[PDB]
Amino acid sequence: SEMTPREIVSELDKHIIGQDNAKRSVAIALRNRWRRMQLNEELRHEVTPKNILMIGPTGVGKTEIARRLAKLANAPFIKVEATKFTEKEVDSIIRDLTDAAVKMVRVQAIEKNRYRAPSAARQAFRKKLREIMAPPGMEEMTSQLQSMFQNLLIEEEAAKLVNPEELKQDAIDAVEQHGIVFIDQIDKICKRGPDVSREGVQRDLLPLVEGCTVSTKHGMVKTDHILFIASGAFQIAKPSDLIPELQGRLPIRVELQALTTSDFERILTEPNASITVQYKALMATEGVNIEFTDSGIKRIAEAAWQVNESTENIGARRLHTVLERLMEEISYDASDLSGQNITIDADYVSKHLDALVADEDLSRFIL
Amino acid sequence: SEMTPREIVSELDKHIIGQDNAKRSVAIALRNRWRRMQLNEELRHEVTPKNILMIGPTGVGKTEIARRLAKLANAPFIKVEATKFTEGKEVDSIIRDLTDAAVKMVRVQAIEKNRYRAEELAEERILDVLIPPAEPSAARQAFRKKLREGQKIKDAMKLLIEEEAAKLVNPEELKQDAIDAVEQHGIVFIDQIDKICKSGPDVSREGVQRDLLPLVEGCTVSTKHGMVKTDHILFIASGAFQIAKPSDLIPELQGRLPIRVELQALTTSDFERILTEPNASITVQYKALMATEGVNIEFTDSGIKRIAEAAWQVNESTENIGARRLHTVLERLMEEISYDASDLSGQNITIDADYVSKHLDALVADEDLSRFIL
Amino acid sequence: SEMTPREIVSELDKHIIGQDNAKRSVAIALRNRWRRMQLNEELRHEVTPKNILMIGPTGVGKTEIARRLAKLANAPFIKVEATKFTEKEVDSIIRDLTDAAVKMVRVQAIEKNRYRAPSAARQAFRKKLREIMAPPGMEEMTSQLQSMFQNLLIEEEAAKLVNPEELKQDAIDAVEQHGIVFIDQIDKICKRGPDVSREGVQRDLLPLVEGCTVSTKHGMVKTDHILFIASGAFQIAKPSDLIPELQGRLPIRVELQALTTSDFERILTEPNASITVQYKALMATEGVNIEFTDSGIKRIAEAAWQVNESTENIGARRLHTVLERLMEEISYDASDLSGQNITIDADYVSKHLDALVADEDLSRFIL
Amino acid sequence: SEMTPREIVSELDKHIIGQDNAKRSVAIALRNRWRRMQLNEELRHEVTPKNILMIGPTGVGKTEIARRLAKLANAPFIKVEATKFTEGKEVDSIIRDLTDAAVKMVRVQAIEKNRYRAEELAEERILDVLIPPAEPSAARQAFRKKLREGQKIKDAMKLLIEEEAAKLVNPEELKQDAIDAVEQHGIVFIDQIDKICKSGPDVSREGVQRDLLPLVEGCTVSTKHGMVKTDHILFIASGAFQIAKPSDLIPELQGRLPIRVELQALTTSDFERILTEPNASITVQYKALMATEGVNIEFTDSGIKRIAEAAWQVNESTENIGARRLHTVLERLMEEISYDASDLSGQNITIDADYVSKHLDALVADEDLSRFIL
Amino acid sequence: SEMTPREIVSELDKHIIGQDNAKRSVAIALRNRWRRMQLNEELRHEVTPKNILMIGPTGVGKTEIARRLAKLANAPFIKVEATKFTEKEVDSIIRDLTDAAVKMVRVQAIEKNRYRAPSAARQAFRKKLREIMAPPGMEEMTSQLQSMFQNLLIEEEAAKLVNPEELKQDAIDAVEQHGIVFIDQIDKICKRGPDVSREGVQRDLLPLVEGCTVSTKHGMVKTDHILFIASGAFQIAKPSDLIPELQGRLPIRVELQALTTSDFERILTEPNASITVQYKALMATEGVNIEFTDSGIKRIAEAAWQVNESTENIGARRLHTVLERLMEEISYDASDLSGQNITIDADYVSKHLDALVADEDLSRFIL
Numbered sequence A, C, E: 001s002e003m004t005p006r007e008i009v010s011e012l013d014k015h016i017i018g019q020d021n022a023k024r025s026v027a028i029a030l031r032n033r034w035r036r037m038q039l040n041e042e043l044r045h046e047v048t049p050k051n052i053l054m055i056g057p058t059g060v061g062k063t064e065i066a067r068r069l070a071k072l073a074n075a076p077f078i079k080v081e082a083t084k085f086t087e088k089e090v091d092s093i094i095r096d097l098t099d100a101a102v103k104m105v106r107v108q109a110i111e112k113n114r115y116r117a118p119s120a121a122r123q124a125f126r127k128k129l130r131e132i133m134a135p136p137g138m139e140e141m142t143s144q145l146q147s148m149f150q151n152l153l154i155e156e157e158a159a160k161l162v163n164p165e166e167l168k169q170d171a172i173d174a175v176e177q178h179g180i181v182f183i184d185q186i187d188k189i190c191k192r193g194p195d196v197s198r199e200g201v202q203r204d205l206l207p208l209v210e211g212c213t214v215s216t217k218h219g220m221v222k223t224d225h226i227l228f229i230a231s232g233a234f235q236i237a238k239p240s241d242l243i244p245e246l247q248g249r250l251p252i253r254v255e256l257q258a259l260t261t262s263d264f265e266r267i268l269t270e271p272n273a274s275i276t277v278q279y280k281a282l283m284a285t286e287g288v289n290i291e292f293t294d295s296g297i298k299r300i301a302e303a304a305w306q307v308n309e310s311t312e313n314i315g316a317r318r319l320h321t322v323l324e325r326l327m328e329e330i331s332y333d334a335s336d337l338s339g340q341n342i343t344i345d346a347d348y349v350s351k352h353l354d355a356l357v358a359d360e361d362l363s364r365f366i367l
Numbered sequence B, D: 001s002e003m004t005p006r007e008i009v010s011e012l013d014k015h016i017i018g019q020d021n022a023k024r025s026v027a028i029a030l031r032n033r034w035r036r037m038q039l040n041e042e043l044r045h046e047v048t049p050k051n052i053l054m055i056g057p058t059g060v061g062k063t064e065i066a067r068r069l070a071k072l073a074n075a076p077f078i079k080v081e082a083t084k085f086t087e088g089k090e091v092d093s094i095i096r097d098l099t100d101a102a103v104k105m106v107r108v109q110a111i112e113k114n115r116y117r118a119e120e121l122a123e124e125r126i127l128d129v130l131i132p133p134a135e136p137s138a139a140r141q142a143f144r145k146k147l148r149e150g151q152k153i154k155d156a157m158k159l160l161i162e163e164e165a166a167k168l169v170n171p172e173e174l175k176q177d178a179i180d181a182v183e184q185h186g187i188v189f190i191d192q193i194d195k196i197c198k199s200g201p202d203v204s205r206e207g208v209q210r211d212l213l214p215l216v217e218g219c220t221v222s223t224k225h226g227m228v229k230t231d232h233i234l235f236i237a238s239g240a241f242q243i244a245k246p247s248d249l250i251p252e253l254q255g256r257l258p259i260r261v262e263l264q265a266l267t268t269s270d271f272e273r274i275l276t277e278p279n280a281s282i283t284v285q286y287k288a289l290m291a292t293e294g295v296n297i298e299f300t301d302s303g304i305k306r307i308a309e310a311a312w313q314v315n316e317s318t319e320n321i322g323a324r325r326l327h328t329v330l331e332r333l334m335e336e337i338s339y340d341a342s343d344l345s346g347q348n349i350t351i352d353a354d355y356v357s358k359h360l361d362a363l364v365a366d367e368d369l370s371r372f373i374l
């Protein structure tokens, strides 16, 4: 895509609220992709992706930026927990990214084949018509062996139209050129002064960012120009605790601000397909019409902020648990309330929540 | 390649700055490869690669020399962290991953030779349906013109490239080429070898050395692409050796590293050179990148001087990461231009010393913030 | 081979310097091989190889004796570090030995097929003419499955002349009859009083020497008559610390003496293809002629002995690091010095080395 | 085999010296196999092998009895160290490795039967090209004579041995024979079982016993060669039992070892017998080996007496390894003759008591040296 | 089978001596099987097997009851040591049970094909006539791959008569309906207050009893209606120490009494194919006739009880070691004693045993 950095941020504002510095940082990395293609043969090999390190408390949108970014560029995407490797091989990151790129380009290939998939009597009828047991590591291998053994109209036409050798070669080029990976909670593999096992994971991840080659059943993939987005609260450790070889491979740094009560009020409504809009369409399925007052949206955001300050701050994720606890009575009766217009006023919010928010011992369970 | 040792160093000077001793040492190893092939049948077996042990602080260009060296020789290359084997994976995976890189290397390079001939015969194939045969016919050329001018039909040209490139390629000559490329030209870089030197960990630390021993003394490893022998593979080990010393390595390993070299720490003056002198230096990279948006950036000598001073202060204020600090500092300076470069099309921007201090000095002043941002 | 023990030692003297007791011991074991074949059917099963245990400091030639011995008998050979199994199965020793025996008999089969590989116009032109992804353990298995899937003029003729069923059956008989294995640093698996894991390796190695059967993709190999050569400094532990079942399986013992300065002077020159001869041929490739004075060879041996006495004694391996440090200037300028005769006198040795040998702190790095 | 228990002991006396109780105990187990086959369908299932537990110091011939016993019965055999499973490998590998030994055993023995008939039909095949058919013809014999006299042609005789031996062999009768050989005749020796007796290690020690339990109580193990049942396999466990006792074994395991026997320690007199009396004794072995070089060695009775005394002193001076000490002492005495035997062809050497003391007493006197050399 | 609970116990009395409460408990579980089949479609899914937990010292017959029970019902059977999983997957229990069910139904299928497997000259002659190397986990997989590669008159007829698709489908129905599993020494995986690894095994076994599905090369097996019989001394821990999810899945509990001297006297003779009867038939093979006096049988039982009270009580298993120690002289001379009638009187028992039983230090080895 040829979108300029401001055009990228403007699209991210349709989903993510605030955190513009993180939006500006990801826009720079995605714009350098298009900038690299316009360069000559020599510079395209020397220039490498400007990988980003997001820093901030949980639930502030570090992942949603990476998700919407890859969804914006139609790029292959995967999220991985860095701690998973403290105990799987690191090369699986590129494998799973390709398997997602395969299904992505494949279902997209069906889209091109879908729409392809007269006598007066011809139009008349046309109008009326309208076992192999293996350990877990090789379970995917025995799958392919079983599919090889089995080998030895929408389905037959789409198979006739599709080019399987093209879809497999394309997904590699979609990964080598446009791929994106998100390494969540990278701060937890930094040295606490386990430090050998923690820093050992950093060394195992190093070739993926330094440019290496990973074999896959779909083909041979190179990790040279893949973009990476690490994230971590970095409250315990600091980015300087990362190994020097890794710090130099994350040229862009950014800190995401903690969300405020006003941000919660915006997140509930402004973003496209916001959670409040979702239940409004859900209750519309039952014939019920729900409407949230601005005071009702205010106290909901006020309720989530209190739980985060009372016990544990989980970020905007607290909005999900609170909203479902508020609408639980409506969602159950929504079948019997068909044809009725329900209003979520400030009194309705205080009725279903203030008794719960007041008891911190209960808030740790119900919310 | 038949390059003489001075020709190797001069090419390395186009990328690496300074560290001439490490350049001279790697040049001797690569020259011994060509010197060996000229020898008789007996001496070619007895002579073994002169493996090198790089020593110095991190980020001084130890790996870059090995990378540019293998790229100069078009040789298979892989960087392996010696600490990966402390936990576990088998050591033989080094040769396995090296061949996989050599497979993709010889394959993509073989596509470069097939990129040309395939288009000719693919044109001859597609012209057989337009002008079926019963000097080129005049209609054979009249269609050949409209084809090159541009035009399932359009999908068919891509399918013939595969069938012709597969017909032109010799897989037994290709999959066996990567084996010849590994056995004859292969190169391996073993980073942070000093950390496996020497009671509990000393057994597991030195155990990794003995697992690595057959690879340098010569052995044979089985791979899915074939059977590879490691007798003539060149190896480059590196380590800071501040906690331990090369003498702490097992004696069988000290004798397999005949060349030793220490790399000097980079100075502020070297940072200024790294920013500009090397071919496709990072400052040149950002210049051509902003050029893509139609902006012309230019760095003043004092502007370059203050970036190197900025990266040096962070390395001294907190942690010294070598010349890697130049990358984090530069993008932090250019982040405002890189975002606005779309709206700044047609303008000539100048990175002066005042601009560098405006965007950086406030950050370098706070060491608490430098650890997070730089 | 029908070589007598003195004929074996005489050939080993062409490579190894001194250490005659170890040369005499290996000659006895190799001669018993030929002696066993002349015996009747009963005694050939009861007699077992006289395995040897070499004892001495590192770098005194314990391995070179085993290497030249197997190279002298054209026998399959492999070196293994006993500590590798403290963390691979022990049966891999026989597998890798066969894979080396296969490549040995195979390239030797090409030698027999190589030389096999008129009209006046006939002689005239004759004159003008002149993806499957698996864990690391089964990577070799998927190789064979991939080679089976692919199955389902020098190359075509050598394949037409060779007998693949013969080469595979021969390599087994070459292993079962003439095979040799070298177990380096066996002293490190003795009990230090880990002792369970150390002695556990001794128990795992026991069936290989007591006569057992190991399966291999090339075939079923028996370890009855394979010769073994263990080695260890035995400075910490002693051979009596080995398990009793293992001590009885090593009937021959020998101690290799520490090399002296005079031995270094001999090792540099006397052995065939000595290291000094190697660089002389290497510098001859550049058109340069190097010549070492007897005083120059003396001070080189004197230099290596000082480093071994100053910090750590690595045996004759110190000669390699010292010599390359001395010739580093010549090896770099050898291109520009074409047609010149360079002499390595005693002054040249003292110029490039005495400054380094004097500083022990630097000798631990550069040498 | 239908050998009676006394016939078994008498054959074991040809190899093992003394230890008659262990010979009588193993003979009862092997005789019960033949006794079971004579029984009806019901009793053959209910009766199970009388497993034996050998007890005594190392090197007294516990394993040799089990080896000669299985070799006497031509039965599959394997020795497994019980401590191997403390770390890990599965216990079922015992039956897997046993079948692999039984596969090679029945295969090489099947080659012995095919060694004969194949040569006859291979001759009939090669005579068809010399005298193509349109009582043996006179030319059929005239070529058969020149063939047996000796002579691709020479390579062809080897290829027909494979095709005929493969045609003569019945693989379903062979690969299934090794299964019958394991199930009906299989024997397993479990060395040092006393070391897995009984808090931390006691769970892992006794855990191995419970993993071994299904093999003796009866079970079924899957192998690549087939499906094997362990109900009728004989087992022989051994251990010094100085740290622990057989009562320390798990109760389900004590009941599966109905026969118990203690092996006495070997004396100096027994060493003298071991050197000479057993068939193909080591002294006989060195005699026939020096014979190959054309030397005739002869050991005096006092010379044999002083070798046994030499091995005994080392076992008492340092570590007692049993009769294994005889091997290390003997070769150390014969190492000078074994090297010179080529030049000594045609001479009669005599190993007297003076010769034994000349080469050994200096070594036995220094206990510091005996640990390294003997 | 339609056997009533008393008919089951009456058959168990032919092998097991006493312990009637355990015989009554297993009879109830086997009778509920037949009772479930007579129920309607709904109740057959809701009713689940009444699993039993046997409690008592070792060697009192806890396993023989389970063995004879499965042999009585011709059901597939397997015994497993719960401690084996403290270090194999638990799903292997169902796999090995099916492999035993396959061989069971297969050899039973040969029985149906066995009996199927005229001119005067016809009756006359009729009268005169009368390499792939894998780690241990996938060794069974490579077996099937090797058998697939090989694929690509009693034997040919039985193969022609048998229905291989029927034998594989039947063994699953034989497991899903009639299967039985015995988990020995379940008391050792209870918490001692390892407790995580011990109770972790209890959680891994839970789905097998709670009704789950286990894949197998023979087919997909369901563990819903499989009967299970756990056993343990429960001297250290108690059944209440088991996890609550497991206690509810063992509705039947029973304690097996310690065997007395009188029971040993009965076990030696009364059970069908008793050990004394076995040696009588064994010595009959040698032409010898052995006969045990009631006083001889008495002192044998008295001897075994003394060893159990002196050192360690192994239950009725002590009878095996004692009897073989008594008959060792006869079993060796039985060949030379052909045609003789030997009597095992009380004096014969005291002669061969009292010297051994008196020495407790020797009893720990010989007996």
Ligand SMILES: Nc1ncnc2c1ncn2[C@@H]1O[C@H](COP(=O)(O)OP(=O)(O)O)[C@@H](O)[C@H]1O
Pocket: A015, A016, A017, A018, A019, A057, A058, A059, A060, A061, A062, A063, A064, A065, A231, A267, A271, A315, A316, A317
């Ligand atoms: N700025 C924001 N705008 C809109 N939604 C947000 C924002 N920040 C957080 N959220 C919501 O909260 C959740 C944040 O989770 P996530 O971004 O995965 O955590 P983190 O940011 O710690 O990686 C998302 O489900 C998202 O819908």
Ligand SMILES: Nc1ncnc2c1ncn2[C@@H]1O[C@H](COP(=O)(O)OP(=O)(O)O)[C@@H](O)[C@H]1O
Pocket: A248, B015, B016, B017, B018, B019, B057, B058, B059, B060, B061, B062, B063, B064, B065, B238, B266, B274, B278, B322, B323, B324
């Ligand atoms: N002499 C040099 N010339 C140019 N760039 C350098 C030099 N030394 C270091 N760099 C830069 O700093 C980084 C050094 O990292 P690397 O060489 O991998 O570390 P090490 O030298 O410790 O192995 C590289 O990204 C490289 O671009």
Ligand SMILES: Nc1ncnc2c1ncn2[C@@H]1O[C@H](COP(=O)(O)OP(=O)(O)O)[C@@H](O)[C@H]1O
Pocket: C015, C016, C017, C018, C019, C057, C058, C059, C060, C061, C062, C063, C064, C065, C231, C267, C271, C315, C316, C317
């Ligand atoms: N007696 C000798 N004669 C010739 N070269 C020797 C001798 N001893 C050692 N060397 C040299 O030193 C090295 C010895 O290493 P090696 O024999 O593998 O160590 P070790 O003897 O401890 O096993 C060899 O490369 C060999 O060239």
Ligand SMILES: Nc1ncnc2c1ncn2[C@@H]1O[C@H](COP(=O)(O)OP(=O)(O)O)[C@@H](O)[C@H]1O
Pocket: C248, D015, D016, D017, D018, D019, D057, D058, D059, D060, D061, D062, D063, D064, D065, D238, D266, D274, D278, D322, D323, D324
């Ligand atoms: N009674 C004996 N007769 C002959 N040789 C014996 C005897 N006892 C021991 N040996 C010799 O000593 C060694 C004993 O080792 P082994 O029997 O395996 O040990 P263990 O008896 O402890 O299992 C064998 O090599 C054997 O040749």
Ligand SMILES: Nc1ncnc2c1ncn2[C@@H]1O[C@H](COP(=O)(O)OP(=O)(O)O)[C@@H](O)[C@H]1O
Pocket: E015, E016, E017, E018, E019, E057, E058, E059, E060, E061, E062, E063, E064, E065, E231, E267, E271, E315, E316, E317
């Ligand atoms: N009541 C009994 N009747 C007959 N034999 C018994 C009885 N109890 C024990 N036995 C014998 O003792 C042994 C008991 O072992 P087992 O039942 O497996 O131990 P546990 O009962 O502890 O599981 C069996 O071999 C059996 O022959």
